[PDB]
Structures are given as C-alpha cells and as structure tokens.
C-alpha cells in the first residue's frame, strides 16, 4: 500500500554500460534512414527507363552547391539544361526542408551514397561557396578531400581506438561553420564558438549509425588515402583542428 | 458596525512556526505527483503484456538525453529501433510540455523513479550533452555521479541538520545552468547568475516533498556512497560549489 | 456675452489647504476597498460551515509566497494538500489580476487583514523568495519584521509629525525592488532607481487611506515593538534607508 | 496659353508681415476651444441641480494629479468618495484621450479656467508627482507657483515687449520634461533635450490664443505677484531657465 | 537562327550625350505636375465665387508650418478661424499623403506657385519650426530668404555654367535635414550625412523640370537679389555649404 | 539483400573534372534567360508598328537609374514625357520584382543587350546615383566605362587564362556595394565586406553563361578598349581592386 519502498527500491538496480549504450543508440529516432532511400530509389530508377546511378550523380553534384530545395527551379540561366532535372523530380517526389523520413531529400541522397559524393567532391571543392583558396587562408596546411561535405560526417566513428575520430569531428566542424556562415542569413556579430549547438546534434547523430559497420568506415577513410593502415592521423586534420581547439 | 476594530484586532494572533510551515508545504500545488504515476504506470504495465520496469528503464535512458518531447519521433536513423517506443507511448499517452498533472511526462518518470535513474546515469554521464570532460574543465575535482540530473534534485533536503543540503542545491545548480545553456535557444550574452530565477522554483519545489521521508533520502545519498554515515560532505560538492558562490 | 471676464475672474478664488486636501484624498478612486471585503468574506464564511479566520490564515500564508493567481493550481506536488483550497476558492470566487474592486484578490486579503499577516510573516520571512540572509547581505543591520510585505505599506502614514513615515516609505521601498526583481521577468539591465515609478502609485495610495485612523496605525507599529511610545524610529529602518537614499 | 508667365508672375506679390501673421494665427485649427466649454458647462451646471463652479473645482484638483482619463474609476480606495464623480461625468460626457474638440476633457477644464487652477495649485504643488522638494533639488532658487501646470502655459505671450515670455516658455518647459518623465512609460535612456519636440507644438499653440487679450494675461501674471508692474522678471524663472539653456 | 550575333552586335551603336540626356529627363515620371494644378485650380477658383489667388495665399502660408495634411483639422484653438479652410478644401478635394498626381497637395500648391511662396516666406521664416535664430546658430552668416522651403528647390538648375547651382543644392540641403529633424519621429541617434538618401531623389527631381526655362529661374534668383547679374554667388550660400561639405 | 556493399561500393567511381563541371554549369537553373527575351521582344516589336531597338534603348536608359519597377509610374514631373512608356509596357507586360523567367524585367533587357547598354552608359555614368566624381573619390585612378552596371557582370569570364576575370569580379564588385548602398534601405552600421553574400550568387551566375562564347566576351572587352590584344589588364581595374582586397 506504500509507494515509497518501491520508489526507493529502484536504487539497487544492476547497471551495465553495454546494455544502456546499446539500447540508447537505436533510440536515436527515425528522422532520416539511408537504407530506405536506396530501396525506393532503386525501384524508381529500375522501373523508369533511366539509370538511377547516372541520374543520382547529377542530383548529388547539384546538391553540394545548389542547396536542398530545387523547387524554385530558377536562377539566371537558359532553359534546356535545367529541364532534365524535372523528370527526376517527378519520380522522386523530392520535398523542401524536412517533411518526412520516407520523403527523400538530396542531402540524404548525398549521405546514403556519400562515397560517390567524396569521389565527385574533389574537383568541385573549389567550386563550392568555400573556395579551396579561402580555405587555404583559414588553414595553412593542405586540405583533406573527403572531410569537406557536412553530410560526409556520418562515416567517421568517434568510438574508434585512440579517439582519432573525435579530433575529426572537431576538425571537420570548422568547415561547417564557414558553410553555415555563407548560408546562414545573419553573420556580422555571430560567434563561431557558440553557433556550434545548431547542427551539432545532427552531426553527432551522423557519428553513430547502424547503417555502416566500423570496417566499412575504415574502408572509405583508407580509400581516400588520408589515413594509413597503421591508423596514423593525417597532419592536416589535427593541424586544422588546432584553430578550433584554441578558439573554441 | 465598525470594520476597523476587527481589522486591527487580527494583530494579536498567536503565531507558531510549525503550523504555518506545515501547512505552507502542502500548499505547494498539484503540478506533478510522483505517487499517481507509479499507480497508473503499474496498472498499465500489468494489464499490457510487457514488463513496466524493463520499458521504464528504456524510457528514462531516452529521457535524459532525448528531451521531454518524443512526438517528433524523428532524428536521422533507421526504423526498427525507434519502433518499440510507440507501443509504450500509446498505453502511456505521453504529452508534450506540461498539459496536466495526471498526464505523464518522461521527466516525471525519471523523478518518481530517480534512484533507478542515478543507477543508469553513471555510464551515460559522458553521453549527455555535458560531457564528463567539459565538466572536469568546469570543476577540477572529480564529479558526483548522482547530483547530475536536474530531476535528481528532489531527493535532497535543505532542512537537514548543518544545512549540507543547502550547499548541494547550489552545487547541483551549476550543472543545470550548463544544461540550460545547451537546451536554451539563446546563450551568447546571457549570464549564469541571473538565469537562476528560471528553473529555481521547480528546483525548490523538488527540495520539499511529502513523497519521501528524510530516511529515504538519506538511504539514496549514502547508497551512492558520496556521503558517509558521519554525514561528512564530499569534497566534490562543496569544492564545485565554490565556483558558483564566488561567481554568484 | 463675454467669456473672458469670467474666465479671468476665477483667479481671485479663496483657496484653503484643508478643503482641496480633504477632497483630493477621497478622490483616490475605487480600485480596492478593504471594508467591502471584510463584510462579504464574513457573510461567506458564516454561511458556509467553515471558519473564515482559519481559512483566511491559510489564504494569506499562501498569498505571500505563491503569488496572486492560484487558478493554475499546479506546481510539482501530491494532490490532497492542494485540495482544501478549492472549497475556499468556490465561495470566494477569486479572480486573476485585477478585474474588479468587488472581486477579491488574496493580496487584498492580506492588506485588509494586514496585522494578522505581519503576525504570520515573521517565521516565513526567510521562506519568502527574499531570504532573511540575502537581506542581511543587502543591509548589515537586523531586519524589521513588519515592514516586509509590499501590502504592509498601507498602515504607515507619511503625514505623521516629524515625517518618520516618509523614511519608512523609502526604507520599505527597497524590499519591493528586490521582490519585483524576483517576480519581474527581465532583470539584467534594469535599474533599481528608475523602476520605482511602477508600483510607486499603489504604494502612495496605500499610504493614504480612510480605512484606518492614525491611532490604529500607531497601535500596529508599537505592537511590533519597532517604534517606542516616544516615537523614536528604529535604527534598522533609517539605516536600511541610507542605501536607497545614496543610490537613489 | 502659357502657364509659365503667371507661375513666375506670382513673385512680385506685395508682402506685409501683419497680414500673413494675423491670418496664420487663426489658422491654428480647431482641436481645443476654451470658449465652447464655458458655454456648455454653464448650461449643464445650470440645468442640473448642482453648482458648476463647486463641481469644476473638484474636477480640476482631480485633473492635476489623477491624469486625463477617469473612466477606469479604480485605484485602491473606499467607495463613497469616488461616487460623487459619476454624477458629474454623466452630464459632462467626458471622453478619454482626444476624440473631439466639442468633447470636453478635464485638462481643457483646467486650461479654460486656468486662473482658478493656479489658485488651487499652490498647496497641491508638493502633492503632485513632482514634489516641491525634488523640484528644489532640480533648481536651487524658490519655485514659481503659477508656472507649474503644463496647461498653465496658454496665458503667457511670447510676443510681449523685451521677450520675457520667451524665457518663461523655456523656463516652464523643464517642469514638463520631469512630469513627462513620470507619466512617460520609458525613461532610462531618454534625453531631456530631444524629447522637447513632443508636447512642444501644443505648448506653442497655447502661447498664441485668440481667447485672451494681452491685458488679461498681464492681470494673471501680476496677480500671482511673480512679476511687478515695471515688468521685471522674477529671478526664479530665468535662474531656473539657465539649467535648460546650458543643457539644451 | 543565332541570338548571339545580334546580341553582341548592339555594341557598335552610335551614342550621343544629347539624345539620351534629353530623353532621360522627360522619363522622370508623372508623380507631380505643376502645370495641371494651375489649370484645375484656375477653373475651380473662377467657377466658385472666391478669388483663387487670395485663397491660395492662405493655403500656402498654412502649408509651410502646418504640414501637408489638414484633414485632422484640429489643434487647440477657437472655431471661426479654421472654418474658412473647409470651403477651400471641398472644391479642391485635397488628399493626405501622395495618392495621385492629379490630386492636389498643398506642397504642390507651394511648388507650382513658389515665387509667391518666397514672397510670403520672409516674415514667417522665424515663424517656421526652424527659427531664424537657431539657424543663425547653425550658420554664422546671415540667411538666404528664398532657399528656405524644401519645395523651393525646384527652381535652381544644377546645369548652369560654373555649377553654382550644385553648391546651392548642397547648401539648401542642410535646412532640409533640420526640418526633417523636426518632423521625423526619431532623431536621437540619426546622422545628418546618411539621412540624405531619403528626400534626395525628389530634390534632384525638383532640380530638373520641363516646367520652367532657365531664364525663368534666373529671374526668380535675381529677383530675391541674392545673386547679381554677373552671377556671383552670395557668400551666405557657399559659406553655409562649408558645414555640410566638411561634415558630409 | 545487403544495402551496405553497394552503399560503400559507390566509392570507387571514376571521377573526371570535365564531366561534373560541364554538367554543373547547365544545372544553374532557369531564373533568367537572355535568349528567350530577344525572340519574344523581336516578335512583339515586329508585330507592333514601332521599332523594338529604338524603344529598347529608351527602356534601358530608363532602367539604369529608374530602378526595376516602373508600375508606380510617378515621380514629380509633367505628363506627356512619361506617356510614351505605357505603349511599350502593355505589349511587353513587364512585371515588378522577379515573378517568372518568361516575364521580362528591364534589367534582363539591359543584360541580354548589355553591349548597347555599355554604349549608352558612358554619358550617364555621372548621371547615375553614383556620380563619376564620388567614384573618383573612392578610387584615385580614372574609371572603367563598361564595368559600371551590375548587369554588365555577365560578359566577363573568370575561367580565362591568367585569371584576369577573377580580378574584374572583385574590382567590379565595389561599385555594386555603393549602388547597393544607395538602394538598400539601411546603411548606417552595415559593412561592405559582409554584405557581399547578397547579390554575390547572381553575380557568379552571371560570370558563367551558355549564352556567349568566350570570343564574344573578348570582343566586347577589347571593343571598349580597356584591354589590349596582348590581354594586359587595365591599371584601373586592378588598382581599384586593391581597395577591396585590402578592406575585404
Ligand atoms: Na529552343
Ligand atoms: Na525492413
Ligand atoms: Na488517494
Ligand atoms: Na456603505
Ligand atoms: Na459663435
Ligand atoms: Na496637354
């Protein structure tokens, strides 16, 4: 008849790291699933008389610089070039912002197929609003190809031995602020340090994913060649990271 | 026929500390009752073919980091993991914000069953938005497991002999500001000292509760092991408190 | 046929201090009448099978710390304690803010029966949002029991010989700013000096009342014992007043 | 057939100071007429079984401190005293703010019958929100009875020989800022110099009126006794004016 | 079939100063026509049994100080003087602000018949919100009669040999800022330099007009007598202009 | 049955600069097409009994200074001159702002036929809100005719050997800020450096166009004569650019 003994009785519960961590990761909700997208895009591309991969490549390259919403479909140019996009949009039913998980957005297209994106990204790194040169100005050392796109963040794992991934998360973070700086409407008085709270949560959400095993992430990171098999971190990542670590 | 004599006559009323204090504590309203929750959750869990304790554990671990509202049910991840939560939500009828006392919120789930929460909290203390490391940066001395969660505040009693609890209230307060700092939308110019007025009232409301006798609170605090039977305060609590006391 | 001679003719009107002062005090409107409240509360309490005085005591003690509006009837606690209040509310028909003069608000309950309130106030002075200790920090000298509550202000008369009451009005004013400081939503940049204009008008309205003769006010003030029969002002009132007088 | 010759032809128009000045003064619109008020108030007071002068005196004394709008009819006091005002209000049909010229406002009551107002004003000068003492603090020299009320401004003429009136306008202006300071909702950062533009136009409108001949204004000003027959300005007016002249 | 050759072919177009300048001046739109006003006002005045010139004089003198909108028809004065204006308003159908070109506003009345306005302006220059004295304070040298009113600006031509008119435009500009300063609602932090962009466009629009030949403008400017036949600029205009030129 | 292998498999995609660059340029949307305009304007002008070129010249000269929207059709001038524009507007169906790509705006008229615009621009360069003189004040060296209009930006190619075009983009940019400065409603605290983000995207969109081959752009730039056949950059462009490069 007494609530108090059970209420206090919870105390002596046996707690194990692994069970709350294992459950707490798969609690990270349902906002964006990579795996669903590949199935639906594959079905759409197969059914339609066009190659999904060829189309997707165009969609991603469009994504990096053009932004998430293409519905405006207007920005100072001749008609036939933009025309091809419409075919793709109709079958995909892309929607502006984030209406739903099942709804596909181009940034999800980049994220789910991020290795192809890093492959494309190299030549358009300068092409992006953040030039390779402005970025050389920000950090003296030569820039990491792969760590550019904010969606790229999902692959790297913070839980890797020696915590190298942690550094990456910070190191990769700074591009974001500058990219935020370009897309964010107000910049003049804003501080790089504090703004981190916005976009930080999706970034960490990206860090932990059930989609890719650790081996897969390792394969990408060695594939760019930035990290050796001995797992020694590239000088560029940590050295770029010092600016943030100092400035916080 | 004269209002004045009675009006002045109230003056010579015999006043005793104990009667106004005893009545004034049970006046603290009906916003949130721990005891109601245990009865309704027990009934729901028993009636449904699932274990209330096992479910509740998941609900709390979800609560600490995920925030109070789960209805958005969306944040960059694969479907099956989030799926289990829905079953729980339907029977519980959880509602966003604070609509009603009888309505259950997950933070009330943590609060009513706070000892289980402290038991879970240890490994996820780093996992929370405030890392164990950032917190080591804020206070040099090693951190108190139990005093982390803002809902944890309810157990400690300020009225204990030697007023140790008072210190705790201040000492525990600082985590709150930082956690507020993360969840609060605007941080840049805000001051830690002044912001105390928000959340202070529920914190003090937490300090005084009819739910737990003093012995019960003592059992939790000795159970963590932070305080001895001689009731000597851990160095960590007061030493962490000095930062606030100085900075106010 | 000429407007000008009469218009100028008003000039030589015989003016006496006493007649404009006597009329101008009873012009101070009808926002809040103490006397009406005692009659209606007495009728309600007599008609209902409960003691009005016993109930009222609870209502006032609730008033000092809980604020004027109880309709939310919710703040983190168990059900049976708050339950008793409802009975009282139904018969009283209390309304939030200031809708009408006849409508009773709890602060009017405190004001009309302020001597009982000073009698209760002593032990809960620390209990109020402004602690006895913070208040010792603000003023080095030991604090006056009676002069705490902002509603207490009505008793004291500024028109008393030697103008001691004037000092009190200033001296009592500072608690208000701090209490305002707690309840006022924005505090950070606000100045204690300038904010005086808000709440000053009801405070002065309180100073002058037809409800109590001077003898009655004298009885309360000597009853607390703060002022002797020789009418020497307590050191605490004036010494506390110096902070305001300096800071303005 | 040419517009240009006539358009240029206007140039050689014979211009005389007196005709444009004489016409431009009676152009000053129809916002507030003193003369209409005396006729309608006289009719109302005569028709009703009450003395208009006795009532009006109360209405003005109420006006100086209570503000223009009495419709709220509520401010912390007992019922019978405020009750008498209603009778007056019904026959007068007073309206809040400035709805119409024919509509009477209490400040118009003060203005049209301003000599009676100066006669009343002396004892309530301290009583007003600006105390005689605060005003002694602002200006070291002893204060002018008549020049207090902002509505008083209408009598004085700037066009008088030696321009003494001009000084008065400036000298009288400073009370206004302080009174504005009390009634104006925001004071903290506002500057006394710049705020002059608000209320300046009605003040100058007051300076020039067809209602009173110069002799009438002279009669009031000598009647207070502040100015001699030799028309020597009181030391108080100019000496008080130096603060404004310096501070601008 | 190629768009490019014609598109590039436009390049070798023969361009002459006179043809684009001549066309670009008569492109300056249809917001306000002086000539239309004289025809309609002449018809209205002739048809009605009143003299248009006599009426217009009153309308302009009213315009300089009273502002553009007379519809409020209310500002602290006796009835018969304002009464005459109504007759004029009905036939003219004056409208507040700028609704239409055909609609007449009093400032257009001043502008179209600006020489009469300069003739009236002399005695009321002090009468205007900017006193002759404050203006002596701003500029040490004696002030130009004609260059006061902002509507006066239309006559002067910047294109005159030696560019004297240019100086005038700057020199005349400063009165505007001060007049703006009086009518503009917010003054405290505003800068005289930057505010120029507002009202600058109508001012330049005024500088260039098809209404008056250069000879006509010359006739006005020599008629005031400020400029000799040798076209030597008055010391007052340029010397007043130095303040602006320095301060920018 | 596994999503992961294909997802990782995208990595080893063969990436070539030319194919993503070639596709990414014709992705730049459909906001504004030069080529469509020439066809529709040609049809309209041919069908109507007026010369499209003669009309267009007027429309452009109107465009440079008058702004994009002519619908207000009102700004302080006589009727017949503005009248001719209406005929043109009806057939063209010009619309304010940017409603549609097919909709023609006058700035598109300038852009598509920009060589004619540079031909007109020379004499009206001073005529524009930014005077030739203020511009001499900003940059000591003599100003480039062609690089003035913001719409002029489309011709120059950044991809030219030695990157001279890049300099131009920066060098030409500064006029824009000043022109923005005039048309932009708020200027006082704004910074030239940061404001670049607005209008930068259409400027770069202008830099890359499928409309003109490189030879065509070369023809314009040598035609103005600012750049020799040896492709040596004019001193004016780079020397003007130093101010921006320093100030950023
Ligand atoms: Na085509
Ligand atoms: Na599945
Ligand atoms: Na119960
Ligand atoms: Na009664
Ligand atoms: Na009359
Ligand atoms: Na005509």
From Swiss-Prot, chains A, B, C, D, E, F:
Keywords: Capsid protein, Helical capsid protein, Host cytoplasm, Host Golgi apparatus, Host nucleus, Ribonucleoprotein, RNA-binding, Viral nucleoprotein, Virion. It is found in: Virion; Host cytoplasm; Host nucleus; Host endoplasmic reticulum-Golgi intermediate compartment. InterPro entries: Capsid_Phlebovir/Tenuivir (IPR009522), Nucleocapsid_Phlebovirus (IPR015971). Its main location: virion. GO terms for molecular function: RNA binding. GO terms for cellular component: helical viral capsid; host cell endoplasmic reticulum-Golgi intermediate compartment; host cell Golgi apparatus; host cell nucleus; ribonucleoprotein complex; viral nucleocapsid. RNA binds at residues 29, 32, 65, 69, 107-108, 188, 198, 201, 208. Belongs to the phlebovirus nucleocapsid protein family. Encapsidates the genomic RNA, protecting it from nucleases. Displays high affinity for single-stranded nucleic acid. The encapsidated genomic RNA is termed the nucleocapsid (NC) or ribonucleoprotein. The ribonucleoprotein has a non-helical structure. Serves as template for viral transcription and replication. After replication, the nucleocapsid is recruited to the host Golgi apparatus by glycoprotein Gn for packaging into virus particles. Homodimer. Homohexamer; ring-shaped, necessary to form the nucleocapsid. Homopentamers; opened pentamers in solution. Binds to viral genomic RNA. Interacts with glycoprotein Gn; this interaction allows packaging of nucleocapsids into virions. The N-terminus is involved in homooligomerization. This is Nucleoprotein. It comes from Toscana virus (Tos). The lineage of its organism: Viruses, Riboviria, Orthornavirae, Negarnaviricota, Polyploviricotina. The gene is N.
């Amino acid at each position: 008849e007494n609530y108090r003994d059970i209420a206090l009785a919870f105390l002596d519960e046996s707690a194990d790291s692994g069970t709350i961590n294992a459950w707490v990761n798969e609690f990270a909700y349902q906002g964006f699933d990579p795996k669903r997208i590949v199935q639906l895009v594959k079905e759409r591309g197969t059914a339609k008389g066009r190659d999904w991969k060829k189309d997707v490549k165009m969609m991603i390259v469009l994504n990096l610089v053009r932004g998430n919403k293409p519905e405006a479909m207007m920005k100072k140019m001749s008609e036939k070039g933009a025309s091809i996009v419409a075919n793709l949009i109709s079958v995909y039913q892309l929607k502006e912002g984030n209406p739903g998980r099942d709804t596909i957005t181009l940034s999800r297209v980049s994220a789910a197929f991020v290795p192809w994106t890093v492959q494309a990204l190299r030549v358009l790194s300068e092409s992006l609003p953040v030039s390779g040169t402005t970025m050389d100005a920000i950090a003296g050392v030569t820039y990491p190809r792969a760590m550019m796109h904010p969606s790229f963040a999902g692959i790297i794992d913070l839980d890797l031995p020696n915590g190298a991934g942690a550094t990456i998360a910070d190191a990769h973070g700074l591009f974001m602020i500058e990219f935020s700086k370009t897309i964010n409407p107000s910049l003049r008085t804003k501080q790089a340090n504090e703004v981190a709270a916005t976009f930080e949560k999706p970034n960490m959400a990206a860090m932990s994913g059930r989609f890719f095993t650790r081996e897969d992430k390792k394969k990408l990171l060695i594939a760019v060649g930035i990290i050796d098999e001995d797992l020694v971190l590239a000088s560029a990542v940590v050295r770029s990271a010092e600016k943030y670590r100092a400035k916080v």
